[model samples]
Target: FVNQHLCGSHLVEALYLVCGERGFFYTPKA
Candidate 1:
């Protein structure tokens, strides 16, 4: 999801990439 959002937004990519992995890792799937 963020990967798509990363387009044209290097800063977003950097921020997202940093927090994204942790967000996904801790998220509860249902």
Candidate 2:
């Protein structure tokens, strides 16, 4: 699951990273 805070601040792209990438803790700063 994606971090609600991150998903809130970052765009859906953060969800993409959380949903797609296995290791996307720091997937580019939005």
Candidate 3:
């Protein structure tokens, strides 16, 4: 479960980076 959480966090960070490169913004839902 801990690894899963870390993976999800990393994925979101990567997504944000990619979006940021494209001048797009990412806002995660709560």
Give the range where candidate 3 is weakest over 10 consecutive residues by summed lDDT.
1-10
When superposed on Cα atoms, how far off is each prediction in RMSD? 8.1, 6.8, 5.8
lDDT of 2 by residue, 1-30 (tens): 454555444755665665685634444565
Per-residue alpha-carbon lDDT of model 3 for 1-30, expressed as tens digits? 224454456866766666776764445674
Name the top TM-score candidate: 3
**Model 1 lDDT at residue 26:** 30
Q: Note the residue pairs that clash in candidate 2.
A: none
Backbone clash total, candidate 2: 0
Clashes of 3: 0
Q: CA lDDT of 15 in candidate 1?
A: 63
How does residue 4 of candidate 2 score in lDDT? Answer: 53
Structural RMSD, model 3: 5.8
lDDT of 1 at 1: 51
lDDT for predicted candidate 1 compared with the true structure = 0.51
Error of 1 at 15 (Å): 0.7
What are the models' TM-scores? 0.34, 0.29, 0.41
